[PDB]
Design a protein around this ligand. Structure first.
Ligand SMILES: NC(=O)c1ccc[n+]([C@@H]2O[C@H](COP(=O)([O-])OP(=O)(O)OC[C@H]3O[C@@H](n4cnc5c(N)ncnc54)[C@H](O)[C@@H]3O)[C@@H](O)[C@H]2O)c1
Ligand SMILES: NC(=O)c1ccc[n+]([C@@H]2O[C@H](COP(=O)([O-])OP(=O)(O)OC[C@H]3O[C@@H](n4cnc5c(N)ncnc54)[C@H](O)[C@@H]3O)[C@@H](O)[C@H]2O)c1
Ligand SMILES: NC(=O)c1ccc[n+]([C@@H]2O[C@H](COP(=O)([O-])OP(=O)(O)OC[C@H]3O[C@@H](n4cnc5c(N)ncnc54)[C@H](O)[C@@H]3O)[C@@H](O)[C@H]2O)c1
Ligand SMILES: NC(=O)c1ccc[n+]([C@@H]2O[C@H](COP(=O)([O-])OP(=O)(O)OC[C@H]3O[C@@H](n4cnc5c(N)ncnc54)[C@H](O)[C@@H]3O)[C@@H](O)[C@H]2O)c1
Ligand SMILES: O=C(O)c1ccccc1O
Ligand SMILES: O=C(O)c1ccccc1O
Ligand SMILES: O=C(O)c1ccccc1O
Ligand SMILES: O=C(O)c1ccccc1O
Lengths: 268, 268, 268, 268
């Protein structure tokens, strides 16, 4: 592959799940990939497996880690063409009264402000390279999700901030886009399902949520990212849905504790 | 009620279902309402029950009926303030290979071109009154629907044409908006459910499609219409969703004939 | 007016601008309105002018102020039917490198977490009343805005969180919706324009941004809010646009420092 | 290139403009491309220039031409993997009173029913190949356009029908997606600009409509199409925007004949 040959790419949270999918997709396209992750285990494993992937330990909520990540990427590689803000977390299901403003704040540090800080520090270099930014939002930013008020809020923020940055940076030719994956089968998905009374039933409901009848794969988000960076030169501020059609058509939305009348009083 | 007192309102398909809901809502607001319907039974009944509602027999696919409707409304009432394009039909479920281009054309005559013809003839009078147009689209125009390719297409057209008209008519101060109802309990809904092997199970799936756990009522669309005409003077080209939240969150979207793997191969 | 008679309504930032528009609209509908504002001047003025409007000093970023606001509203009035989260701020234009993570955080405290905290504390009472929540987001949450990365992000968060809450609260019958105003002529708009080299030229560009050719008024957002609370019982999780059509059609989007070729090389 | 090697692709309107962009992009990916066009000049030229591109004369509004196109593609190539419905026309600017129902109908035959007829006949073969459909809609389907009520309506229909087909065809694994290009520099764009009093000023306004400051190219839509067909296996029913950001941020929307007050009465 040569669609992104020699470009320098930073992927946050690139050590597993969707981030690793994106890392492999960019390596496959010929890029130099800086894996940024707070966990050294998965990243150093990719670094050793994929030459041209390199691991730099970095928590994106720690402003110094991000300055050092950026500082090292330029020092080590002389340029920066693409930033894929992927580091993010989804808490276990929580009703609104089970969330705290403190938890919300911590989650904004990761999902939103981490994405913002790396982008701020990266923009002077992306301007020189006429690079682009890719943020990994989520479909629930667009249509909501049950028991995930903080998470949904951070993803609504990422998608909107992507459009704001696209306007601020178009005078420099720097594109700024986001991918909104639906249900992607990842360790995070697996870890969350394992907290449920019936994990496999929960995973099954995850697959049935798509007209296509399955969850997506990290590789498929990785292809979407490589397309945005390498072949979508007239795309900026877009929200690319990788969702298997989950947002389409009617479905079972009234919840298992939601009072529903019998079908003889259909409209109350 | 006085929020729309003495304004002259035309409601197509106003003889039953959502159209009658809208007719009652405008009468309640003090308007003069011209009920336009191809069926005389339901309309003349409203005309007799509601003074200030008046029935004019008119098939909106028949250009002469629409010229005569418009011609009679001005002759009889001297002005035209509001056109609610509601006349529309939803065919029984049909797979794509069960539709014909002829059926599609007939359905466009009603759902789209009927709305277009009345609007064209009404605009010279709406310009003088600084009136507005309200089109009744559907949520499936926005998110699709199974087994309804022609219907969905006509509703995608209505929603888009609403925005085109809003731009063409804003120099005159004529607002042009649409309501996109989700599942509304109406005779049409009832007639379609009755074609199913299990009508009440189908109606129940209709109610479960909403987080609110019920279908909407015609009166609730009627309130939305009266709000658009009488109190939304800074609204034009909007799509007002009356859907009970159907478009929100994940749901059961993989269809009963869609191959789905077991939850041990979640992503294929 | 009687469309919301005797319901108890809290409006944050109700002391001027859009908040005061909403306060007057609910008072006009017959509600008991608790004006919540951090500035006593504008609120106490409304409290004295409008009986049935009452002012309670409260900064929504101060968790104790919000507990006390909620505690006093129930103690004083015995119920809570409607929360209009309107308190919000738009900073002066700032390029991305002119924003700080600290400023972003402060802005999230107001625009997002203030809305979240009042909603959390209000929900137990809204559940009993089968009330509803109305958040005042912004159109730029949906389509972005130049030189406003933090602000846009907080409004993307508000709009998404509205959908998350609508799902979490539909089992209780509590609707949760937002209004996304476009350009509304308010003191905040005036204050921001006054920071510009040519205020009136800037205000003029604000009016030209709408096909309707003007900015909106607070009263028009107030009507939209009263409609959501009092007549949109089948609406939840919707984004109601009060924008004068700003999001429609093509416009002048390439910025005054954006390199644009001459029209003989149209596509680069 | 090998991303779509040996797949059989039909591109309607493939003889020039965006269609030819898509044809070259698929040929470049290794596909067998059947150029379908009503004009033989541009298509036979591509057929001779690009081996593996083949031209079949076909007007998509003529049901027999489409049956013969489909019949010949299978007979000649034994399979059908991808249908790119691109044939479409944009009439010169027309106010609503300058359109006729007849013109509207003719435009629906091309833009909508042509897309529908080829898809119907192609689906039995796409099911066997687990192929996909790509419709070329337009951004104005989503946000409207001035003086283009019929055109906008047909494109609203194409985008919605894409979602309906995606639901109907997901049980077979057949993806169905659309691209919504903004302003793309093509012969059609050039022909329309040439009808204006100042063509180059009009082209310049076309470029300024994008934050990126230029129009798109056919090659860029071609890349988007090849991505949808060859690498977006978890995408169905999506609307991929190729618009240079035109839908983002505020712009000059109040039209040159739209009454606008001076900036001392900003909100009427
Ligand atoms: N899995 C899904 O279905 C899904 C859906 C929509 C969006 N997303 C988004 O995709 C991204 C990845 O999701 P996933 O399922 O692959 O997650 P994951 O948990 O499987 O992997 C996330 C990676 O990010 C790293 N990370 C976490 N916090 C970090 C921090 N502070 N600094 C640096 N690295 C950090 C983790 O160590 C891990 O390697 C997230 O932003 C998530 O919100 C996922
Ligand atoms: N019912 C729903 O759930 C639902 C959902 C979304 C949109 N809608 C739309 O709302 C509108 C009304 O739906 P409904 O369920 O109330 O339907 P309905 O069948 O119950 O009533 C429709 C009315 O329109 C009249 N009509 C039909 N064809 C006409 C024609 N050619 N000329 C004049 N009048 C004509 C009928 O005679 C009838 O009185 C339609 O446009 C429909 O697409 C309905
Ligand atoms: N003006 C516009 O064009 C526009 C457009 C879109 C959205 N909005 C939103 O509408 C809301 C009001 O905007 P506006 O133009 O009327 O603003 P404004 O400045 O004119 O009034 C805002 C009010 O909120 C109060 N407030 C501010 N911070 C507060 C806090 N921490 N606690 C309590 N009260 C607080 C202020 O004292 C003031 O009374 C904001 O949320 C804003 O983002 C405004
Ligand atoms: N140019 C733009 O800015 C733009 C923007 C949005 C969408 N689009 C869409 O993209 C498509 C192509 O646009 P373009 O600008 O490249 O147009 P174009 O006029 O430059 O080329 C269109 C091609 O389609 C062919 N065609 C027309 N009618 C046909 C018919 N009945 N049967 C078969 N072939 C037919 C023409 O002969 C021509 O080769 C259209 O569907 C258009 O609506 C274009
Ligand atoms: O849809 C999501 O955003 C999501 C993210 C991580 C894990 C499970 C999920 O459903
Ligand atoms: O959702 C619709 O458009 C609809 C319309 C009429 C009848 C049943 C329906 O689901
Ligand atoms: O569009 C906005 O969100 C806005 C809000 C406050 C002031 C000016 C504005 O344009
Ligand atoms: O935006 C469009 O759909 C379009 C299509 C063809 C020509 C010019 C255009 O603006």
């Amino acid at each position: 592959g040569t669609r992104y040959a020699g470009k320098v790419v930073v992927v946050t949270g690139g050590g597993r799940g969707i981030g690793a999918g994106i890392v492999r997709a960019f390596v496959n396209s010929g890029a130099r990939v800086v894996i940024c992750d707070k966990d050294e285990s998965g990243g150093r494993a990719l670094e050793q497996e994929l030459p041209g992937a390199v691991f730099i330990l970095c928590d994106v909520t720690q402003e110094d880690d991000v300055k050092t990540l950026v500082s090292e990427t330029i020092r080590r590689f002389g340029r920066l063409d693409c930033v894929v803000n992927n580091a993010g977390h989804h808490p276990p299901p929580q009703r609104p009264e089970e969330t705290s403003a403190q938890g919300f704040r911590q989650l904004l540090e990761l999902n939103l402000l981490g994405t913002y800080t790396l982008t701020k520090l990266a923009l002077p270099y992306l301007r020189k390279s006429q690079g682009n930014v890719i943020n990994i939002s989520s479909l629930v930013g667009a249509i909501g999700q049950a028991q995930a008020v903080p998470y949904v809020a951070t993803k609504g923020a990422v998608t909107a901030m992507t459009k704001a940055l696209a306007l601020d940076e178009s005078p420099y030719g720097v594109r700024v886009n986001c991918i909104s994956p639906g249900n992607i089968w990842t360790p995070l998905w697996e870890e969350l399902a394992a907290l449920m009374p019936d994990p496999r039933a929960t995973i099954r409901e995850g697959m049935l949520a798509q007209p296509l009848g399955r969850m997506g794969q990290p590789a498929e988000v990785g292809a979407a990212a490589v397309f945005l960076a390498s072949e979508a030169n007239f795309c900026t501020g877009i929200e690319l849905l990788v969702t298997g059609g989950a947002e389409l058509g009617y479905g079972c939305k009234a919840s298992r504790s939601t009072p529903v009348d019998a079908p003889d009083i259909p409209s109350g």
